[PDB]
């Protein structure tokens, strides 16, 4: 699994690969690991699949019911605190996942949540098994002054560099850009294939 979250000024760029693997065996070449939880909020799952899908359904219900009962979207620290309280109440019969929550609430935020409920905000985060290769690219090429398109090209370079050296990562890259003006925008396959083919990458 490979999972990236990038905070830029007025923007959150989150992206993944799509491979589902059974111990060495590529069971599914097109998974879905990047979800829209709320209008300005997306989470991204890694780890076991069934636990993570249950968490996605539950958080879509909780955030939509919150939005209906309160007339304004849930803040991102409250989303991450809600997942922290949920994941920590079991702790011994645990959900074996790790999650990223990214969104806009007059400030872009990326929260990284582990299997026991420790939510930590950071300017860029990455979960999965291909995580250290992404962290290797983002230690050397990330800058907080980048535009949105340089951010998308950076995350495509990071996940491509993780796909070259991790065997549990691969497939098409799903990128989603979250802004206040346009909202949660799932970038199309054609633009991502154009950026992959343009930057000199064969995926």
């Amino acid at each position: 699994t490979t999972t990236v979250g990038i905070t830029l000024k007025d923007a959150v760029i989150m992206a993944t690969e799509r491979r589902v693997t059974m111990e060495n065996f590529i069971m599914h070449k097109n998974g879905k690991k990047l979800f829209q939880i709320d209008t300005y909020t997306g989470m991204t799952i890694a780890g076991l699949v069934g636990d993570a899908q249950v968490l996605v359904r539950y958080m879509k219900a909780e955030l939509e019911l919150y939005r209906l009962q309160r007339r304004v979207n849930m803040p991102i620290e409250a989303v991450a605190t809600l997942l922290s309280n949920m994941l920590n109440q079991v702790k011994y019969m645990p959900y074996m996942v790790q999650l990223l929550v990214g969104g806009i609430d007059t400030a872009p935020h990326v929260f990284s949540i582990d299997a026991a409920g420790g939510s930590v905000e950071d300017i860029y985060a990455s979960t999965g098994s291909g995580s250290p290769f992404v962290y290797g690219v983002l230690e050397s090429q990330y800058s907080e002054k980048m535009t949105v398109d340089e951010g998308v090209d950076l995350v495509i370079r990071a996940i491509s560099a993780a796909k070259q050296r991790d065997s549990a990562s691969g497939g098409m890259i799903d990128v989603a850009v979250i802004t206040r003006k346009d909202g949660y925008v799932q970038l199309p396959t054609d633009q991502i294939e154009s950026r992959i083919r343009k930057l000199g990458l064969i995926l």
Binding site: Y58, E64, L65, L68
Partner: protein, 221 residues
């Protein structure tokens, strides 16, 4: 709540007497869409008009308008919201609105048998878009469901229904159906009373639920 020798439940009849003192509300099916119209008689100038919501959303596809006792109405709207989210968690989407109405109405029926609890004094109107398209429902304090095409609940029900079995036609556009509902709501009022700005909400097939803002309603008056 026991039977009368006539074969009647008295607490349900008295609950309907409590329903006949609520605000008048309409639901109208138009060409691929549903309307809900509610009267917004704010008497004092001191009531904040920014947060008086008569048309409650249960889902961004499904809304309901209530009449009767407002506290029991708030309880039934909260139960309808939790039941809708349980259907979204269990199945993935809300395929039929009718079973949401059957879960709310089977909550309302249960208090008309057990002796340690009184019935709800609330009649509701549900409305939304599912796979069968635009659907409109009415729920009676006995727990009785009727699927309709145009209906009213509240104090001035009979004037509005009596207007809508002589003035309603099937496949109106949105603006003509809103105009018909507004003149229905004027037909419920007696003279001396002018409509202050009511609340109108609409949905069309494919789109989400659109609630009208203020100046559009004042233009529709």
């Amino acid at each position: 709540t026991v039977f009368s020798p006539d074969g009647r439940l008295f607490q349900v009849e008295y609950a309907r007497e409590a329903v006949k003192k609520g605000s008048t509300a309409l639901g109208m099916k138009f060409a691929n869409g549903v309307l809900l119209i509610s009267d917004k008689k704010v008497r004092s100038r001191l009531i904040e008009q920014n947060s008086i919501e008569k048309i409650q959303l249960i889902d961004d596809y499904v809304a309901a308008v209530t009449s009767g006792l407002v506290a029991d109405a708030r309880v039934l709207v909260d139960f309808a919201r939790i039941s809708a989210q349980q259907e979204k968690v269990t199945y993935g989407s809300l395929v039929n609105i009718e079973n949401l109405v059957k879960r709310v109405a089977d909550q309302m029926q249960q208090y008309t048998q057990y002796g340690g609890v009184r019935p709800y004094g609330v009649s509701l109107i549900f409305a939304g878009i599912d796979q069968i398209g635009p659907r409109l429902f009415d729920c009676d304090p006995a727990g009785t469901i009727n699927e309709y095409k145009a209906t009213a609940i509240g104090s001035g029900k009979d004037a509005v229904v009596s207007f809508l079995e002589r003035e309603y036609k099937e496949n109106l556009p949105e603006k003509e159906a809103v105009t018909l509902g507004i003149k229905a709501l004027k037909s419920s009022l007696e003279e001396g009373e002018e409509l202050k700005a009511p609340e109108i909400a609409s949905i069309t097939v494919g789109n989400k639920y659109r609630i009208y803002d203020q100046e559009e309603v004042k233009k529709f008056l």
